[PDB]
Coordinates of C-alpha atoms in Angstrom, one line a residue:
Chain A
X1 CA 112.9 43.6 167.8
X2 CA 116.2 45.6 167.1
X3 CA 114.1 48.1 165.1
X4 CA 111.2 48.6 167.5
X5 CA 112.5 47.9 171.0
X6 CA 113.2 50.9 173.5
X7 CA 111.9 53.5 171.0
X8 CA 110.3 56.2 173.4
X9 CA 113.2 58.0 175.3
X10 CA 114.9 59.5 172.2
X11 CA 112.4 62.5 171.7
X12 CA 113.4 63.5 175.4
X13 CA 117.3 63.3 174.9
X14 CA 118.1 64.5 171.3
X15 CA 121.7 64.8 172.6
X16 CA 121.9 60.9 172.2
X17 CA 120.5 60.8 168.7
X18 CA 122.5 61.0 165.4
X19 CA 122.8 64.8 164.3
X20 CA 120.4 65.6 167.3
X21 CA 117.7 65.1 164.6
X22 CA 114.2 65.0 166.1
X23 CA 113.0 63.7 162.7
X24 CA 114.6 60.3 163.5
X25 CA 112.5 59.9 166.7
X26 CA 109.0 58.7 167.7
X27 CA 107.0 61.3 169.5
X28 CA 103.6 60.0 171.0
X29 CA 100.6 62.4 170.3
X30 CA 96.9 62.2 169.6
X31 CA 95.4 63.4 166.3
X32 CA 92.4 65.1 167.9
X33 CA 94.3 66.5 171.1
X34 CA 96.9 67.9 168.5
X35 CA 94.4 70.8 167.6
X36 CA 95.0 72.4 171.1
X37 CA 98.8 71.9 171.5
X38 CA 100.1 75.3 169.9
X39 CA 101.7 77.5 172.7
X40 CA 105.2 76.0 173.7
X41 CA 106.6 76.2 177.3
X42 CA 103.3 77.2 178.8
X43 CA 103.5 76.3 182.6
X44 CA 101.4 73.2 183.5
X45 CA 99.6 75.3 186.2
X46 CA 98.5 77.9 183.5
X47 CA 97.1 75.0 181.2
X48 CA 95.3 73.0 184.0
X49 CA 93.9 76.2 185.7
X50 CA 92.9 77.5 182.2
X51 CA 90.7 74.4 181.7
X52 CA 89.3 74.5 185.3
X53 CA 88.7 78.3 185.4
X54 CA 86.9 77.8 182.0
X55 CA 84.6 75.1 183.5
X56 CA 83.8 77.4 186.6
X57 CA 83.1 80.4 184.4
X58 CA 80.6 78.5 182.0
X59 CA 79.1 76.7 185.0
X60 CA 78.6 80.1 186.9
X61 CA 76.9 81.5 183.8
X62 CA 74.5 78.6 183.2
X63 CA 73.5 77.4 186.8
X64 CA 74.3 80.4 189.2
Chain B
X1 CA 95.8 58.0 160.8
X2 CA 95.6 54.3 159.9
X3 CA 96.3 54.9 156.2
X4 CA 98.4 58.2 155.8
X5 CA 99.6 61.2 157.9
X6 CA 96.5 63.1 159.1
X7 CA 97.1 66.4 161.0
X8 CA 100.9 65.5 161.2
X9 CA 100.2 62.2 163.1
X10 CA 100.2 58.6 161.9
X11 CA 99.4 55.1 163.4
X12 CA 102.2 52.4 163.5
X13 CA 102.0 48.9 164.9
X14 CA 104.3 48.2 168.0
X15 CA 106.3 44.8 168.2
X16 CA 103.1 43.2 169.8
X17 CA 101.1 44.5 166.8
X18 CA 99.1 47.1 168.8
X19 CA 98.5 50.6 167.3
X20 CA 100.4 53.8 168.3
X21 CA 99.6 57.4 167.4
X22 CA 102.9 59.1 166.6
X23 CA 104.0 62.4 165.1
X24 CA 104.8 61.4 161.4
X25 CA 108.5 62.2 161.4
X26 CA 110.9 60.7 158.7
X27 CA 111.7 58.0 161.4
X28 CA 108.1 57.2 162.1
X29 CA 107.4 57.2 158.2
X30 CA 110.1 54.5 157.8
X31 CA 108.6 52.6 160.7
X32 CA 105.1 52.7 159.1
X33 CA 106.7 51.7 155.7
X34 CA 108.5 48.6 157.2
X35 CA 105.2 47.6 158.9
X36 CA 103.5 47.7 155.4
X37 CA 106.3 45.8 153.6
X38 CA 108.7 43.8 155.8
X39 CA 107.2 43.1 159.3
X40 CA 103.7 41.8 158.0
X41 CA 105.5 39.0 156.0
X42 CA 105.4 35.4 157.1
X43 CA 108.5 33.9 158.8
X44 CA 109.6 31.8 155.7
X45 CA 109.6 35.0 153.5
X46 CA 111.3 37.4 156.1
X47 CA 115.0 36.5 155.7
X48 CA 114.8 36.3 151.8
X49 CA 113.1 39.7 151.7
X50 CA 115.7 41.3 154.1
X51 CA 118.8 39.9 152.1
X52 CA 117.0 41.3 148.8
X53 CA 116.2 44.8 150.3
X54 CA 119.4 45.0 152.5
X55 CA 121.1 48.1 150.9
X56 CA 117.8 50.0 150.8
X57 CA 117.0 49.1 154.5
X58 CA 120.6 50.2 155.5
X59 CA 120.3 53.6 153.6
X60 CA 117.0 54.5 155.2
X61 CA 118.1 53.4 158.8
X62 CA 121.2 55.5 158.4
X63 CA 119.3 58.6 156.9
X64 CA 115.9 58.6 158.8

């Protein structure tokens, strides 16, 4: 319990970790979805529009 | 991800014994290690094991 409880916030507040050391912290992340997390500090709108505008472009080509 | 770090991500049990995909940091590697060795032991064996490993546990906790 002492080891495992409340183990998620640390990765968002490295100020409140010993040495501010990320390597101490749990970061939740998917093995397969980790192929496409590369570009840091991309705006959410740029990502989400990127996926949607991709779908539109391919659909247009195939059915219109 | 259930055996070793795979694309920099690993699976670790939570406190309820349910899997979690985490980036395999030093912290998460210690977590995975204590799942394999300490937290899987029966209740009668836990306290003896902790007393025995105490100074190792403590160095890892402070370092990682």
